[PDB]
Tab-separated table of C-alpha atoms and ligand atoms in Angstrom:
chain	number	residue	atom	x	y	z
A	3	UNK	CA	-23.695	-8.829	-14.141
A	4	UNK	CA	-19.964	-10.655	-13.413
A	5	UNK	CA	-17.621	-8.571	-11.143
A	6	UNK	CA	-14.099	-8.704	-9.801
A	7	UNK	CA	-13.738	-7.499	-6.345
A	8	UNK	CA	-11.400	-5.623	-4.411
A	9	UNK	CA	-11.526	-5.261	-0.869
A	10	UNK	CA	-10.308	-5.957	3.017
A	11	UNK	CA	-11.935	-4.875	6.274
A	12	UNK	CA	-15.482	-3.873	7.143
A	13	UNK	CA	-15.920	-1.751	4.128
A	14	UNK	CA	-15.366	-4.639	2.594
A	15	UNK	CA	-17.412	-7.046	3.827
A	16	UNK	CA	-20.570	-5.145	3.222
A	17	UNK	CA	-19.359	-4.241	0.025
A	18	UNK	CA	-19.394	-7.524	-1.037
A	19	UNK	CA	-22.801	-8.187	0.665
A	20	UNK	CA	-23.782	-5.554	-0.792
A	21	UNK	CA	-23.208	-6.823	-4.067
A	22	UNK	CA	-24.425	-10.043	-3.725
A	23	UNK	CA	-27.886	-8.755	-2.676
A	24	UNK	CA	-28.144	-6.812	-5.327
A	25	UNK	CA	-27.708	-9.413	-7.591
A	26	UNK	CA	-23.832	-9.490	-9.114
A	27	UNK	CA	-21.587	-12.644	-9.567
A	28	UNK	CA	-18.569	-11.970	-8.123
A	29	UNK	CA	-16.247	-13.808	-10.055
A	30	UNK	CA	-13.593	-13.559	-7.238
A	31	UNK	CA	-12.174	-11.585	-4.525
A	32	UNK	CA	-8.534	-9.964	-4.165
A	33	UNK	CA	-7.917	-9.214	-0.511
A	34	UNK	CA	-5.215	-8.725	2.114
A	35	UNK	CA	-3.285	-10.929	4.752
A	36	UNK	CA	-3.825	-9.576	8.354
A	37	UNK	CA	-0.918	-8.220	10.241
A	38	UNK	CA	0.390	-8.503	13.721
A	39	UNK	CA	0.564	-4.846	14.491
A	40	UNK	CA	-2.983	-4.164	13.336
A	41	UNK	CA	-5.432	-5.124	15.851
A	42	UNK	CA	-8.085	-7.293	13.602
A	43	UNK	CA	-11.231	-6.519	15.217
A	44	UNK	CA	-13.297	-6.454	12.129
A	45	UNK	CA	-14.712	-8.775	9.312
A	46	UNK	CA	-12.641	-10.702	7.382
A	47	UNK	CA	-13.298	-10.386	3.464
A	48	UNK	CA	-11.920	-13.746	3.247
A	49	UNK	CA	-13.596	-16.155	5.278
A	50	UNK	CA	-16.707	-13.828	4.039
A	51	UNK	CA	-15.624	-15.362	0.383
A	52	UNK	CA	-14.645	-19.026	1.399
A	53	UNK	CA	-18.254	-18.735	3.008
A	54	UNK	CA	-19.660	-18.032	0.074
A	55	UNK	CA	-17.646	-20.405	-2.526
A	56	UNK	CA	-16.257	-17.214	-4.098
A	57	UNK	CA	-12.534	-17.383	-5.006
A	58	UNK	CA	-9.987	-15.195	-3.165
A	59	UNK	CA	-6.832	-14.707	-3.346
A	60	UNK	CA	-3.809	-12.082	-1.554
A	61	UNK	CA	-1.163	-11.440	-3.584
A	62	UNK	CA	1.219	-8.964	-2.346
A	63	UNK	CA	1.156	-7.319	-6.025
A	64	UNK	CA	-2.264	-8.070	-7.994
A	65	UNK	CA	-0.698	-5.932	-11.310
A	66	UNK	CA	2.051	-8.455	-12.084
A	67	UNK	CA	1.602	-10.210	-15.465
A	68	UNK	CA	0.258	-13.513	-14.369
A	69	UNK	CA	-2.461	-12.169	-12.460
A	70	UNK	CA	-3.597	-9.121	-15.375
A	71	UNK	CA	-3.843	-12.553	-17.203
A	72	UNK	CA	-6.449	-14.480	-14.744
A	73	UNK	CA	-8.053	-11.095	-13.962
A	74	UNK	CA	-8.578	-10.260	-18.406
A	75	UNK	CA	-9.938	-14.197	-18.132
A	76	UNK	CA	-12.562	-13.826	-15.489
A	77	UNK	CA	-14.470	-11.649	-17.911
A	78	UNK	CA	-15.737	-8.754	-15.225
A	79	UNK	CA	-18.425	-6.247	-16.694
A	80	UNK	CA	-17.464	-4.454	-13.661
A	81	UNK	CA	-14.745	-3.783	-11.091
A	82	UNK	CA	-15.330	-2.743	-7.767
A	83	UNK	CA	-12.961	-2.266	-4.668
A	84	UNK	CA	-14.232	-1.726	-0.979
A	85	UNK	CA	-11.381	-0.768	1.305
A	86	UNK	CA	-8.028	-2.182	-0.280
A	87	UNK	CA	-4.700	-1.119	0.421
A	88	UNK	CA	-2.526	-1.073	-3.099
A	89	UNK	CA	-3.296	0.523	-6.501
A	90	UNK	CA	-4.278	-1.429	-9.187
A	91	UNK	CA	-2.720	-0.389	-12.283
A	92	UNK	CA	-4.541	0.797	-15.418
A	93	UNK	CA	-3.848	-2.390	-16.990
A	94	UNK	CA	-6.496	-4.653	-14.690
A	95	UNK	CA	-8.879	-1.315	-14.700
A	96	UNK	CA	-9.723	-1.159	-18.461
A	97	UNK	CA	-10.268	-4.691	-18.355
A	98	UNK	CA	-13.981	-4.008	-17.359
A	99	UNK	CA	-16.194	-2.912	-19.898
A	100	UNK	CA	-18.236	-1.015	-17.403
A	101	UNK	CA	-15.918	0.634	-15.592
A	102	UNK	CA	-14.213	0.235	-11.812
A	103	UNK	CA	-15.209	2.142	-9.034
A	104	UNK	CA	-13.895	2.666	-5.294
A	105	UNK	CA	-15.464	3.438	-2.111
A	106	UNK	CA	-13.770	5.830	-0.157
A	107	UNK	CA	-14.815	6.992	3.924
A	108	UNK	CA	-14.858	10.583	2.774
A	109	UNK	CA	-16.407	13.879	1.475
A	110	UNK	CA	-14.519	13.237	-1.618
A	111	UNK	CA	-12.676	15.496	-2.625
A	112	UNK	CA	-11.951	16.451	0.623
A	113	UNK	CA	-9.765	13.737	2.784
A	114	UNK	CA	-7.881	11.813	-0.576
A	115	UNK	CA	-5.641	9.285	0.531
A	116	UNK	CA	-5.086	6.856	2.979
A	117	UNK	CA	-6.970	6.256	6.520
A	118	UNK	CA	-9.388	9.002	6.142
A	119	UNK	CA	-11.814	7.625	9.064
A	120	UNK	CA	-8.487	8.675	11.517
A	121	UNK	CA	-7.562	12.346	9.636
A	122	UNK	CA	-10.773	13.518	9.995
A	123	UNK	CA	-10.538	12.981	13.508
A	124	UNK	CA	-6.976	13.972	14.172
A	125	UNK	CA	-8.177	17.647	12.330
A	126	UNK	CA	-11.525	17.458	14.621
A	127	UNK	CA	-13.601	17.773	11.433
A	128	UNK	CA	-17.716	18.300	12.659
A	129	UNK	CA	-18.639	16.253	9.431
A	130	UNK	CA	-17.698	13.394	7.349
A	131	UNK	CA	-18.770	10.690	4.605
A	132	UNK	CA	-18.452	8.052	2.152
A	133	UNK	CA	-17.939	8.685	-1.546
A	134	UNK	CA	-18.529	6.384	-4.375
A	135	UNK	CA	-16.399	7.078	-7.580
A	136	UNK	CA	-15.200	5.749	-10.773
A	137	UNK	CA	-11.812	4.267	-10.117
A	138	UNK	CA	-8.757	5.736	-12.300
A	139	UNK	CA	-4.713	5.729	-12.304
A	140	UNK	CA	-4.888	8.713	-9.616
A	141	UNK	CA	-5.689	7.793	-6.156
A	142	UNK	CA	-9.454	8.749	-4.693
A	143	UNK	CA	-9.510	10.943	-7.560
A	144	UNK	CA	-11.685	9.422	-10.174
A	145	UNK	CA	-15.723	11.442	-11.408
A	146	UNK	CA	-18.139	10.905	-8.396
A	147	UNK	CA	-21.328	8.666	-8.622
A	148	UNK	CA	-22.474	9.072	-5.303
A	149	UNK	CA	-22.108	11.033	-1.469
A	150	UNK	CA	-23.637	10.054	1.576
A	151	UNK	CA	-22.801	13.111	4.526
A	152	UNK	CA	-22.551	11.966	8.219
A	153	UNK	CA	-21.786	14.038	10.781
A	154	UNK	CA	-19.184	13.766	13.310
A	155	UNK	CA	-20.401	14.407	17.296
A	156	UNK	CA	-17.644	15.562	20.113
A	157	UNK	CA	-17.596	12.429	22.118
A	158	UNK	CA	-17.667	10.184	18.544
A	159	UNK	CA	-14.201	8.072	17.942
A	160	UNK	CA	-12.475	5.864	15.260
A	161	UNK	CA	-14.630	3.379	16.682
A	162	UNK	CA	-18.082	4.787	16.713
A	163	UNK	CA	-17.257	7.208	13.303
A	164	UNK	CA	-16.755	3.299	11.510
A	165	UNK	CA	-19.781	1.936	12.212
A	166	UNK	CA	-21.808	5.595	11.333
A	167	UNK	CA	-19.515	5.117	8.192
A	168	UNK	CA	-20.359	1.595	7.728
A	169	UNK	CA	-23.545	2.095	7.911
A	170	UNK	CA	-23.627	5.165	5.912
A	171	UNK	CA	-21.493	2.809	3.290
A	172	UNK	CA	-24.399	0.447	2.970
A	173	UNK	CA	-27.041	3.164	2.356
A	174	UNK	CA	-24.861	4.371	-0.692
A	175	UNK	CA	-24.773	1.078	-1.931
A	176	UNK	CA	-28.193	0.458	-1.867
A	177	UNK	CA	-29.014	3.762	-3.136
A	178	UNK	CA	-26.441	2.951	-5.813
A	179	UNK	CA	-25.900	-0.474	-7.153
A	180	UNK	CA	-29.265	-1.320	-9.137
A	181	UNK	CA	-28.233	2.098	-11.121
A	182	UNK	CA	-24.973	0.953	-12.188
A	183	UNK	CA	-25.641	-2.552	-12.825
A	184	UNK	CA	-29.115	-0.888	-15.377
A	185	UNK	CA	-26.752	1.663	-16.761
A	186	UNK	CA	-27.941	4.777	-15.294
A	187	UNK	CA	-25.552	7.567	-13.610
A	188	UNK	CA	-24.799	10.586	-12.731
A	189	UNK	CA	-21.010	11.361	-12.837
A	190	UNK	CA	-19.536	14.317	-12.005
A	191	UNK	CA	-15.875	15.229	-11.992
A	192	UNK	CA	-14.017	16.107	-8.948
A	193	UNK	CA	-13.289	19.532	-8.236
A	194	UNK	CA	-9.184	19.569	-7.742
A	195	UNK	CA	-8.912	22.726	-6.032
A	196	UNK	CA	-10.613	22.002	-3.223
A	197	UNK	CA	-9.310	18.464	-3.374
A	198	UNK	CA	-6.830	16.957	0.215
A	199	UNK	CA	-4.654	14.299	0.631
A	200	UNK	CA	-3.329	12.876	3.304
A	201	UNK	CA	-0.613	10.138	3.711
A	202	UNK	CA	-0.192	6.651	4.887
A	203	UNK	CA	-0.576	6.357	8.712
A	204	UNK	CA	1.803	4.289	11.472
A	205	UNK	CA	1.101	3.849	15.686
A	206	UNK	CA	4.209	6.416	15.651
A	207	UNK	CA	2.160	9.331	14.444
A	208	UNK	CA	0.383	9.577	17.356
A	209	UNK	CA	2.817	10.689	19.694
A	210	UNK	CA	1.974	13.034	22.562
A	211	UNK	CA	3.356	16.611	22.001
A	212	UNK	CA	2.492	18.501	25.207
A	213	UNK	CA	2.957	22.109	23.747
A	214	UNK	CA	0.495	21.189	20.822
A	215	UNK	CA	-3.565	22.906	22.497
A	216	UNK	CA	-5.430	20.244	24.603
A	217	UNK	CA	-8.058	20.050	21.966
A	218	UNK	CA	-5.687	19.027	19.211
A	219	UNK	CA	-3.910	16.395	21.764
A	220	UNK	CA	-7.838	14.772	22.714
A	221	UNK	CA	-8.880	14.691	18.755
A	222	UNK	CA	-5.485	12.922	18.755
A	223	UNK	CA	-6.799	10.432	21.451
A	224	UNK	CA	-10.016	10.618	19.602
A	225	UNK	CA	-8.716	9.344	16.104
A	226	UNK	CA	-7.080	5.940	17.427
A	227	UNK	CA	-8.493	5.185	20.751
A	228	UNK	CA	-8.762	1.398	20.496
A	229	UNK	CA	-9.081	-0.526	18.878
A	230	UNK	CA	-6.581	1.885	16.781
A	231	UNK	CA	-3.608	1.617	18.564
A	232	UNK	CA	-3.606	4.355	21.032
A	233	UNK	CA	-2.264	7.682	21.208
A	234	UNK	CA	0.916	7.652	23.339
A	235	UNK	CA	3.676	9.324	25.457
A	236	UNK	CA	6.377	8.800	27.828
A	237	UNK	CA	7.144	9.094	31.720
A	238	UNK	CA	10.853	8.597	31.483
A	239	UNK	CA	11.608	5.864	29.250
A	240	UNK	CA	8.219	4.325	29.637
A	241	UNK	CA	5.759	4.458	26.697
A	242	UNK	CA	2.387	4.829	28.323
A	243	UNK	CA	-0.975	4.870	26.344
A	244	UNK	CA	-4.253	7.398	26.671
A	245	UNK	CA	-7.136	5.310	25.316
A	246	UNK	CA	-9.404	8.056	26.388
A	247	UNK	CA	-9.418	12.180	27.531
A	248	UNK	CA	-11.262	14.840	28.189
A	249	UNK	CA	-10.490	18.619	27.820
A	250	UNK	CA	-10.618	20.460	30.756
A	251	UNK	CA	-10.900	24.530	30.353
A	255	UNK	CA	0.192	28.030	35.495
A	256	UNK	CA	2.259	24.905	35.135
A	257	UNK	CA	4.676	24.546	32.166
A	258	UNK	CA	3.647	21.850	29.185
A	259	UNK	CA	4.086	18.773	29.627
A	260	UNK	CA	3.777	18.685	33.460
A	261	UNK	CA	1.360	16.354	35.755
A	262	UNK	CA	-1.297	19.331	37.310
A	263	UNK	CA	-2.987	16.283	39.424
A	264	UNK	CA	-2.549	12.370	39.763
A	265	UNK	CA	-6.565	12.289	40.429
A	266	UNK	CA	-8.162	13.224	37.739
A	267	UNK	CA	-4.975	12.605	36.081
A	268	UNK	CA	-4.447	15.858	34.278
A	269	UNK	CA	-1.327	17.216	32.387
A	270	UNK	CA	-1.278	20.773	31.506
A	271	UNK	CA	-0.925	21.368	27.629
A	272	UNK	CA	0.146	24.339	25.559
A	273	UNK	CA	-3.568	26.157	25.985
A	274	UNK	CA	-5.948	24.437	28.800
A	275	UNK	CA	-5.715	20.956	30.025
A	276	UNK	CA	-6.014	17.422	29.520
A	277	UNK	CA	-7.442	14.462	31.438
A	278	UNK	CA	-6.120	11.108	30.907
A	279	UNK	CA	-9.201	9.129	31.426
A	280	UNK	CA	-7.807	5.472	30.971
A	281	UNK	CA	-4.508	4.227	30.045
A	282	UNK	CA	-2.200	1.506	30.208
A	283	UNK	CA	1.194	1.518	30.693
A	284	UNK	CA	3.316	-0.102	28.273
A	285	UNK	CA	2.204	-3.649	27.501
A	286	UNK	CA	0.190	-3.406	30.650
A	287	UNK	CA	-3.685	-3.496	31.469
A	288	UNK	CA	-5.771	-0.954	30.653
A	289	UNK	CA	-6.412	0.810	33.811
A	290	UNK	CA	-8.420	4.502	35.024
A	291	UNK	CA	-6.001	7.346	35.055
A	292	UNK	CA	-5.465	7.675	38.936
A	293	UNK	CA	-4.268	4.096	39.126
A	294	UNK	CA	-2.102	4.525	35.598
A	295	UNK	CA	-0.115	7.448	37.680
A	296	UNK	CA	0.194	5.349	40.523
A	297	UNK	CA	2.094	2.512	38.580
A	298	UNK	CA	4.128	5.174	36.273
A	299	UNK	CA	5.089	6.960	39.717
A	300	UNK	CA	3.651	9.997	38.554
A	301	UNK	CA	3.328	13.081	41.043
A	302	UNK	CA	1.842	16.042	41.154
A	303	UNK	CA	4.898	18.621	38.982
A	304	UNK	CA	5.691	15.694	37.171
A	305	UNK	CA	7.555	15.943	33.835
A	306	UNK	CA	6.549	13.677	30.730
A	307	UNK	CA	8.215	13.661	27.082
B	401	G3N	N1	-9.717	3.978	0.388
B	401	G3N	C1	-8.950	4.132	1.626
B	401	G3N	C2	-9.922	4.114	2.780
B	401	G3N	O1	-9.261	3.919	4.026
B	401	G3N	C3	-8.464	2.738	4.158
B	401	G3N	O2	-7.757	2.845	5.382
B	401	G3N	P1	-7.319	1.615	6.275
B	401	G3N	O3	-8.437	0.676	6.183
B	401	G3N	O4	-7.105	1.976	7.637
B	401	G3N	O5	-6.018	1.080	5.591
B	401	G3N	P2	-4.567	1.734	5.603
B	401	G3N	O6	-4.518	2.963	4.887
B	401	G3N	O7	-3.707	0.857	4.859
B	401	G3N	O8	-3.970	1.931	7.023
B	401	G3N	C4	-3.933	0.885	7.967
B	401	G3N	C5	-2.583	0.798	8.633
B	401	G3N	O9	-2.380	1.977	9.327
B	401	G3N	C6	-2.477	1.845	10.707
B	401	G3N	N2	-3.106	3.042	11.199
B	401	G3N	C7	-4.220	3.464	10.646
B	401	G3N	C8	-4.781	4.630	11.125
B	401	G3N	C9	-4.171	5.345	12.115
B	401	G3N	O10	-4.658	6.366	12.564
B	401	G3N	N3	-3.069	4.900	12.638
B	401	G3N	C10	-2.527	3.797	12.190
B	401	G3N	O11	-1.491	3.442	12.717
B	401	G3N	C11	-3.270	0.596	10.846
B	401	G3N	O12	-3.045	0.045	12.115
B	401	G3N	C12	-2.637	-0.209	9.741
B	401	G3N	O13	-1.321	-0.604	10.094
B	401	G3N	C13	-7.417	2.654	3.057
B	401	G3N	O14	-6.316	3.515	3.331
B	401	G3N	C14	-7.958	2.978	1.688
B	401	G3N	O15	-8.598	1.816	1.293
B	402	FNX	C1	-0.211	6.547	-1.118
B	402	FNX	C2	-1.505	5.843	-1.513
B	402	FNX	C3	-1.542	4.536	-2.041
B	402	FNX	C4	-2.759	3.912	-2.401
B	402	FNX	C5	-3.982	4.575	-2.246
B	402	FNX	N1	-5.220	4.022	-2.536
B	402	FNX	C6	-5.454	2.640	-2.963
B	402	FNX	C7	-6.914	2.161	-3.055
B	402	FNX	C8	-6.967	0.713	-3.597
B	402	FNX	N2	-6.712	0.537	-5.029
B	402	FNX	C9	-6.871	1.587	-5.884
B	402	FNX	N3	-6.548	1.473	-7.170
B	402	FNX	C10	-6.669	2.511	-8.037
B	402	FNX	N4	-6.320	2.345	-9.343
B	402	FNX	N5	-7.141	3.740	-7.641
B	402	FNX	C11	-7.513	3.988	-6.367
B	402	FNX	O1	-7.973	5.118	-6.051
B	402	FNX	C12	-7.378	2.887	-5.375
B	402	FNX	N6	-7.725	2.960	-4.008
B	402	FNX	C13	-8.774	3.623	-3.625
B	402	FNX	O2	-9.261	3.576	-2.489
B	402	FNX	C14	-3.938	5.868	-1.720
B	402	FNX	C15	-2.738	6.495	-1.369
């Protein structure tokens, strides 16, 4: 079976592997350029490809005319993307006899959109997934061919979630792949009123808001400790990081309780900044961070 892929990231490196165990030709690879801001810690679907003599290409816009044209060419019986960023129109989707599908890092329909290993997270969710699904015109929306469930511990982050999810991604595929390359599943449509979507997300979002509960602050810390780029506040005009917390059960919001543990009381209960950096500095244990950010005991933070 010939395929053209889709895909950036770890998701998409073991997508691909996946698919070449399994036994597909992928005809070539559409990917991504890296970017300064994001922190590339993970596997890179294009030196996976030049490894592998497949052809790959990053166009910033796959559904112009020229490349439709290579993609109609190519001849896939299927399309699959793993983890990319931009929609591909229906125009390069009908193309494949077969069908497209997507895999998506949630319980489908739940968590839609964009960055769903982080929102899950963020909303302290006790369980998560991957979804595979036929890929349509509507984001994450398209009938669903297969659900692995993976649950989410307390002391789990971005980090540790990805690899569960990963792994959990792998298992799908395996449990999935020989079916649809024999002709043999089970779709079922998604039900849209229990359906959520959630946005594109940027380092700003994860400003500090010292009235919000400590809970909702540390799942906060929790959804981009690094190597997501760190949920932040300030000490005057001084962006500092917290890389990691912990919730600890009369002063106002906002304000420095102790310099050691470093603890700032929240709206309900407090929170411990574990470790920390300030600014563009080293990443340092939270009695030392005070010490460089001149942090006292009644100190005031925004
Ligand atoms: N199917 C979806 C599955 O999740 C992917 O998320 P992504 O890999 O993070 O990629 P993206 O949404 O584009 O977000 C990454 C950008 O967003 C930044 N980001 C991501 C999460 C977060 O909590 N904060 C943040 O700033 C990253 O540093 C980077 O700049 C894709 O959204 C879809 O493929
Ligand atoms: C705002 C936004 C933008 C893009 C997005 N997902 C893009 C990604 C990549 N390309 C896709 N192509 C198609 N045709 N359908 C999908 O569901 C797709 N996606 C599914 O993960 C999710 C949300």
């Amino acid at each position: 079976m010939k395929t053209v892929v889709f895909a950036y990231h770890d998701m998409g490196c073991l997508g691909i592997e996946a698919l070449l165990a399994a036994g597909y030709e992928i005809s070539a690879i559409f990917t991504h350029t890296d970017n300064p801001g994001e922190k590339a810690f993970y596997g890179s679907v294009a030196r996976l490809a030049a490894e592998r003599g497949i052809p790959v290409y990053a166009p910033d816009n796959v559904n112009h005319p020229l490349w439709v044209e290579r993609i109609a060419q190519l001849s896939p019986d299927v399309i699959f993307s793993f983890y990319y960023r931009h929609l591909i129109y229906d125009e390069i989707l009908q193309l494949a006899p077969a069908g497209a599908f997507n895999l998506h890092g949630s319980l489908l329909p739940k968590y839609r959109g964009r960055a769903p290993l982080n929102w899950v997270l963020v909303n302290g969710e006790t369980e998560t997934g991957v979804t595979l699904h036929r890929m349509v015109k509507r984001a994450d929306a398209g009938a669903i061919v297969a659900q692995l469930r993976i649950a989410i511990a307390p002391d789990d982050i971005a980090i540790t979630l990805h690899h569960k999810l990963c792994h959990a991604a792998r298992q799908l595929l395996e449990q999935t792949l020989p079916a649809i390359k024999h002709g043999n599943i089970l779709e079922i449509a998604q039900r849209e009123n229990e359906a959520t979507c959630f946005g594109r997300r940027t380092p700003d979002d994860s400003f500090l808001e010292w009235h919000k509960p400590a809970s909702v602050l540390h799942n906060m810390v929790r959804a981009v400790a690094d190597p997501w780029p760190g949920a932040f506040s300030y000490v005057g005009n001084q962006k500092f990081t917290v890389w990691s917390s912990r919730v600890h059960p009369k002063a106002q919001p906002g304000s420095v309780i102790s310099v050691a543990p470093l603890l700032i009381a929240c709206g309900d209960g407090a929170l411990e900044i574990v470790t920390g950096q300030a600014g563009d500095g080293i990443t340092m244990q939270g009695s030392q961070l005070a010490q460089t950010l001149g942090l006292v005991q009644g100190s005031r933070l925004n």
